[PDB]
Amino acid sequence: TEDQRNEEKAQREANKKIEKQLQKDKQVYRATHRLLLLGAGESGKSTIVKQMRILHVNKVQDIKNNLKEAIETIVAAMSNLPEFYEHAKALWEDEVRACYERSNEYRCRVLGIFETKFQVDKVNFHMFDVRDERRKWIQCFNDVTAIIFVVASSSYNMVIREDNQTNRLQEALNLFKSIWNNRWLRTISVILFLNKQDLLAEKVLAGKSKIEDYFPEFARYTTPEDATPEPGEDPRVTRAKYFIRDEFLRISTASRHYCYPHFTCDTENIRRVFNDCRDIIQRMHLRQYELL
Amino acid sequence: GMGIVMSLIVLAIVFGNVLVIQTVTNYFITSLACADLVMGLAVVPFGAAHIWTFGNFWCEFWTSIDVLCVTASIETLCVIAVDRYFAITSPFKYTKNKARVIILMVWIVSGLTSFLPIQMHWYRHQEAINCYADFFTNQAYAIASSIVSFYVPLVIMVFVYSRVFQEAKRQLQKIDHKALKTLGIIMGTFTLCWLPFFIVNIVHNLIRKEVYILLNWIGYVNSGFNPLIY
Amino acid sequence: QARKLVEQLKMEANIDRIKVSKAAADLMAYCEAHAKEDPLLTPVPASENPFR
Amino acid sequence: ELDQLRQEAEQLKNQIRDARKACADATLSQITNNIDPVGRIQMRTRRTLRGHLAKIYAMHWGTDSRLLVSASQDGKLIIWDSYTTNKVHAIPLRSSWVMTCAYAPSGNYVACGGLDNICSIYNLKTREGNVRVSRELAGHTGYLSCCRFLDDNQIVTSSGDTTCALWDIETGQQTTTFTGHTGDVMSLSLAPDTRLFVSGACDASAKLWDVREGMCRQTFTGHESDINAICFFPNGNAFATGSDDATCRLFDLRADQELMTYSHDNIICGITSVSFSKSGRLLLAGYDDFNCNVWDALKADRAGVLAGNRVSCLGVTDDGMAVATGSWDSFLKIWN
Numbered sequence: 022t023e024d025q026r027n028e029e030k031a032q033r034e035a036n037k038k039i040e041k042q043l044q045k046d047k048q049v050y051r052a053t054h055r056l057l058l059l060g061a062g063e064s065g066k067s068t069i070v071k072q073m074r075i076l077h078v079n080k081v082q083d084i085k086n087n088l089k090e091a092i093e094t095i096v097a098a099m100s101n102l103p104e105f106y107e108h109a110k111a112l113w114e115d116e117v118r119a120c121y122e123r124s125n126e127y128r129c130r131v132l133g134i135f136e137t138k139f140q141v142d143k144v145n146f147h148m149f150d151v152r153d154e155r156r157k158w159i160q161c162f163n164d165v166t167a168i169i170f171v172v173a174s175s176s177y178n179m180v181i182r183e184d185n186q187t188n189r190l191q192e193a194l195n196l197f198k199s200i201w202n203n204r205w206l207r208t209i210s211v212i213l214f215l216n217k218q219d220l221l222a223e224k225v226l227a228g229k230s231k232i233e234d235y236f237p238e239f240a241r242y243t244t245p246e247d248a249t250p251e252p253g254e255d256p257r258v259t260r261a262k263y264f265i266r267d268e269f270l271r272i273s274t275a276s277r278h279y280c281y282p283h284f285t286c287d288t289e290n291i292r293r294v295f296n297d298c299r300d301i302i303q304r305m306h307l308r309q310y311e312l313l
Numbered sequence: 314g315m316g317i318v319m320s321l322i323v324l325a326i327v328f329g330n331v332l333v334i335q336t337v338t339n340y341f342i343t344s345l346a347c348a349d350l351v352m353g354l355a356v357v358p359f360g361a362a363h364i365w366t367f368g369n370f371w372c373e374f375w376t377s378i379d380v381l382c383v384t385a386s387i388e389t390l391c392v393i394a395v396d397r398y399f400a401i402t403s404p405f406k407y408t409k410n411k412a413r414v415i416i417l418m419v420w421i422v423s424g425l426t427s428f429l430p431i432q433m434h435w436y437r438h439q440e441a442i443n444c445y446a447d448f449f450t451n452q453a454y455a456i457a458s459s460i461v462s463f464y465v466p467l468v469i470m471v472f473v474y475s476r477v478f479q480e481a482k483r484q485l486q487k488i489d490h491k492a493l494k495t496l497g498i499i500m501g502t503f504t505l506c507w508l509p510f511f512i513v514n515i516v517h518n519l520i521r522k523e524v525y526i527l528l529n530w531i532g533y534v535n536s537g538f539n540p541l542i543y
Numbered sequence: 544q545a546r547k548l549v550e551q552l553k554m555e556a557n558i559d560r561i562k563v564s565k566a567a568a569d570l571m572a573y574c575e576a577h578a579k580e581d582p583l584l585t586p587v588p589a590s591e592n593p594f595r
Numbered sequence: 596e597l598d599q600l601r602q603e604a605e606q607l608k609n610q611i612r613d614a615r616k617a618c619a620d621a622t623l624s625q626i627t628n629n630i631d632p633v634g635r636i637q638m639r640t641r642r643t644l645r646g647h648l649a650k651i652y653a654m655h656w657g658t659d660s661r662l663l664v665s666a667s668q669d670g671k672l673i674i675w676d677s678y679t680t681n682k683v684h685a686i687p688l689r690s691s692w693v694m695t696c697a698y699a700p701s702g703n704y705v706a707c708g709g710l711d712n713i714c715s716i717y718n719l720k721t722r723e724g725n726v727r728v729s730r731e732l733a734g735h736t737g738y739l740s741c742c743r744f745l746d747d748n749q750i751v752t753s754s755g756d757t758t759c760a761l762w763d764i765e766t767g768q769q770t771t772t773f774t775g776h777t778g779d780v781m782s783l784s785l786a787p788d789t790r791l792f793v794s795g796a797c798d799a800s801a802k803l804w805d806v807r808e809g810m811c812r813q814t815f816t817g818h819e820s821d822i823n824a825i826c827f828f829p830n831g832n833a834f835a836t837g838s839d840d841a842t843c844r845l846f847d848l849r850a851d852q853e854l855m856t857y858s859h860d861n862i863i864c865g866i867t868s869v870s871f872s873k874s875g876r877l878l879l880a881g882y883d884d885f886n887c888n889v890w891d892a893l894k895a896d897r898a899g900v901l902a903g904n905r906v907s908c909l910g911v912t913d914d915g916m917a918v919a920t921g922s923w924d925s926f927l928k929i930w931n
């Protein structure tokens with residue numbers, strides 16, 4: 022019984038140590054919260070992470086690579102419609118400006134999961150990051166408390182990388198609808214951002230494109246009665262501003278799920294939206310499972 | 314002479330608690346169910362003492378059991394309500410080990426102030442001694458038990474449930490019926506079941522002894538509704 | 544690039560296609576051969592079972 | 596012209612289809628219409644296991660048929676012991692996401708996949724105390740879906756980028772690369788001969804590649820939905836397949852024809868995995884409706900049903916005396 026006794030005792034000791042370690046570790050897993058970003062191409066899902074992680078979390082050669090692609094796009098579309106850098110410097114200076122007006126054609130570049138963790142006085146938050154229309158990886162994220170959806174708002178006229186497919190914003194509306202009705206993600210809350218506020222104000226102010234032109238369904242000319250306009254906001258833009266949000270909410274209100282709209286742009290504004298993210302701690306209070 | 318007919322009805326109280334008997338908060342319901350089991354089993358024979366005085370220690374046993382069971386159930390309900398308030402009042406809360414300490418502390422503390430004095434000669438005058446050959450009390454021990462078992466938790470329950478109702482209204486308005494009904498079912502049932510007993514006990518002449526036992530029978534009926542309510 | 548797929552397809556098709564030749568029987572024969580070996584088909588004795 | 600060249604392919608395909616049609620002689624049921632049914636059978640949980648904090652995604656039985664390795668959703672591989680229900684190791688993972696597992700035939704290394712496209716390996720019997728990552732491979736895009744060992748120094752991976760590759764751990768580079776699928780590849784299984792391996796794409800198609808040459812040979816297209824699991828018959832001449840719809844089919848390499856389509860009418864859930872038995876008489880399969888069902892190779896009857904959320908993976912010991920099933924309930928069970 023020499024081999025049996027010593028081996029069994031050592032195995033029991035190892036089991037006890039491992040069980041103690043696992044019990045100690047399992048407490049932190051329940052404590053931490055998880056989020057998950059989504060969105061569309063060129064929406065801005067990952068650029069806010071830079072401003073978000075700057076709050077509490079703690080490439081030069083790669084950046085120049087995207088810079089060259091900037092010069093090629095305008096030159097190539099012209100026909101249809103440091104020696105290299107020194108010549109490009111004159112080209113930047115030489116840049117009629119009608120090429121910029123052709124926005125229909127086609128701060129960081131648009132690039133695996135990049136996980137970011139930041140800690141506060143409250144529980145630290147762990148976030149994820151991400152074409153592929155199959156989306157077969159969506160299963161097995163029922164454990165995430167909230168999904169931070171981000172949608173562009175200044176592109177109601179451009180087109181997706183697949184040219185002449187559909188409206189850039191319309192390509193995001195139907196995608197939200199698909200997320201809304203899913204078997205696995207049937208008990209997850211969704212937060213909406215309406216990014217690129219500054220560009221929208223610049224676009225609408227100087228005439229040119231009209232929402233009624235590209236979107237015929239624009240019967241609502243009067244804003245909702247319970248409207249809290251932004252300080253100094255022009256009445257015309259507010260009707261445009263609330264039009265985007267109401268279109269999303271109609272899909273949300275068609276059918277356990279509670280959607281929250283917002284407005285974001287100014288790193289401190291996102292930081293104010295960060296405190297806004299802290300301010301939205303309603304969902305844990307919200308579940309209220311003991312009927313109440 | 315239909316007492317036997319109602320006796321089998323009270324026998325059904327044990328079945329529900331037995332069937333009822335997992336989460337951090339769900340461990341507390343075991344304590345409430347356990348107290349009901351003790352009250353259901355012990356009180357049933359002692360309740361049928363009506364045609365009597367089975368033994369000298371028999372009076373000691375019923376006295377040591379009933380007070381312990383009643384105070385344990387009241388304290389357990391108080392603890393459950395406190396935990397329910399604590400869960401939703403403060404998000405980002407800051408344990409099974411803590412729960413085991415909490416449950417053990419409440420039950421042992423309650424029994425100590427009840428079982429020990431009852432067997433430690435806490436009673437009265439010339440009429441009381443003749444009963445030895447009525448659960449008479451003296452030296453304000455009834456007052457202390459009433460203020461430390463059925464009176465004290467009521468204020469805490471009222472405060473915490475008022476806070477919960479205040480928070481619920483705030484949550485509803487932020488969006489721009491059921492809460493009132495559920496809170497009423499949870500609270501008013503216990504209030505209506507237990508307030509008459511404590512009211513009559515403190516009235517201690519002007520109260521008939523025969524009717525007095527009837528109210529204390531109502532409080533024992535509260536055990537049956539305990540499993541179905543939760 | 545299409546010619547690459549077509550060339551591969553002809554090579555893949557250039558494979559002998561055997562008849563059934565009682566293919567089920569060959570599958571049946573092996574299954575009938577290892578009837579005793581499988582412990583799930585007929586439960587093992589309690590002493591024989593290493594688990595319990 | 597590609598279309599002009601495609602005419603020859605279609606005629607050859609028509610030649611392929613007609614010749615494949617010409618191989619039909621009789622159904623499997625007619626040949627198997629004189630067999631004694633296995634009868635009703637049920638199994639009880641001999642051992643239960645616990646200790647995870649999240650869902651289990653995959654597991655692999657050891658060649659010793661005693662130790663099994665399982666991977667959770669928190670990134671914690673733990674090597675168990677079936678006899679004593681006692682853990683042996685708890686290796687934390689650099690990536691919180693894991694989707695596969697593998698156990699070396701020599702019982703030395705454990706390979707773990709992950710949503711991050713890194714097929715990291717581990718060493719279990721080196722020095723003492725802490726275990727250390729041996730090599731990390733990153734020569735692919737997408738997410739991985741399966742990892743098996745040919746030998747102690749060769750691993751086969753199947754990513755989600757319509758690519759199946761063969762790795763060499765010592766050099767950390769792709770020796771070959773197999774392509775041809777038009778969609779994502781979800782699973783594979785090596786052959787008992789350790790010479791061929793088949794992979795089930797997501798486009799209702801299956802293939803049968805060759806390791807040595809590096810080129811495809813056949814293609815079966817019997818289904819109409821996503822394919823989720825594959826397992827070789829012990830004879831090595833056939834392999835079952837589990838699809839998104841409840842139909843499970845058994846094909847055959849020699850006859851190139853699908854033989855038996857296990858018709859399921861009352862069943863409405865989806866398949867998650869399949870696994871055979873030692874004698875090839877039973878075909879285990881888990882479902883998406885929280886329980887499991889056991890089929891027959893030929894008679895096509897529900898021999899038994901095991902219950903105990905969704906099941907995510909199965910397996911059979913090399914000895915054949917036990918069956919293990921995972922789940923998303925953070926608990927793994929044993930059956931016998």
Ligand SMILES: Nc1nc2c(ncn2[C@@H]2O[C@H](COP(=O)(O)OP(=O)(O)OP(=O)(O)O)[C@@H](O)[C@H]2O)c(=O)[nH]1
Pocket residue numbers: 060061062063064065066067068069128129130131132151216217218219220286
């Ligand atoms: N003017 C302006 N540009 C913005 C704003 N937010 C984002 N952008 C730009 O949009 C880009 C979006 O890039 P990413 O964050 O990678 O998002 P994406 O392009 O949708 O791509 P993925 O994150 O890879 O899905 C940023 O790099 C910025 O250049 C904004 O508020 N104003």
Ligand SMILES: CN[C@@H]1CCc2c(ccc(O)c2O)[C@H]1O
Pocket residue numbers: 379380383384448454455458459462529
């Ligand atoms: C015999 N009936 C007893 C008498 C005294 C008493 C009761 C209940 C709770 C108390 O704190 C008491 O002091 C009654 O159940």
Ligand SMILES: [Mg+2]
Pocket residue numbers: 132133151
């Ligand atoms: Mg990316």
